[PDB]
Amino acid sequence: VNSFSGYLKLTDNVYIKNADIVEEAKKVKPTVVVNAANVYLKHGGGVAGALNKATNNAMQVESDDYIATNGPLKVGGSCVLSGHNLAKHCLHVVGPNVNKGEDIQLLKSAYENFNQHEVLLAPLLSAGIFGADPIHSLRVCVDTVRTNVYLAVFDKNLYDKLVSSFL
Numbered sequence: 001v002n003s004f005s006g007y008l009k010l011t012d013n014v015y016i017k018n019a020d021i022v023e024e025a026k027k028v029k030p031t032v033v034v035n036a037a038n039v040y041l042k043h044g045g046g047v048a049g050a051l052n053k054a055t056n057n058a059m060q061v062e063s064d065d066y067i068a069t070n071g072p073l074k075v076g077g078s079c080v081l082s083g084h085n086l087a088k089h090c091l092h093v094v095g096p097n098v099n100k101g102e103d104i105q106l107l108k109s110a111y112e113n114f115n116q117h118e119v120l121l122a123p124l125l126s127a128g129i130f131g132a133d134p135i136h137s138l139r140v141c142v143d144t145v146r147t148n149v150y151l152a153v154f155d156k157n158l159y160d161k162l163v164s165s166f167l
């Protein structure tokens with residue numbers, strides 16, 4: 001038993017809710033919140049900009065130190081950093097950004113990072129400003145992640161679509 005509430009069960013291990021991930025994170029305090037990151041951990045907009053704003057920019061400060069030490073992430077890769085006031089940990093995962101021409105097949109590799117964590121609160125990778133089809137992203141998530149994932153979808157219209165078109 002865990003503290004996530006109001007989710008629709010899609011599969012044995014995947015759940016979905018129409019929710020603002022920032023507000024869900026602040027209420028739940030999950031062990032892991034996933035950020036829709038870029039390779040530079042520049043958290044300017046989308047989910048990343050919202051998560052970072054909710055940390056009063058502490059996520060960005062920590063991220064800049066991480067990059068200065070380690071260099072950029074790989075597309076399809078991830079790193080674990082602090083969850084600040086939002087979660088114990090933030091798993092920064094880089095899905096491919098279609099608006100940069102990155103290979104959508106790397107989306108499966110991106111979701112594989114979730115399997116290193118028993119339970120996660122997460123957005124749909126490569127959705128939103130990353131330019132992928134959220135329905136394809138949901139399919140890859142379901143077919144790749146084996147750990148328990150609670151997907152927060154900000155847009156109510158998108159959500160209802162994702163649910164109604166799910167197979």
Ligand SMILES: CC1(C)CC[C@H](C(=O)O)CN1C(=O)c1ncnc2[nH]ccc12
Binds near residue numbers: 036047153154155
């Ligand atoms: C619009 C879109 C589907 C695609 C772009 C955003 C991104 O990928 O960064 C995420 N997003 C969400 O609806 C979403 N879902 C949960 N929490 C969120 N907080 C801010 C947006 C958001």
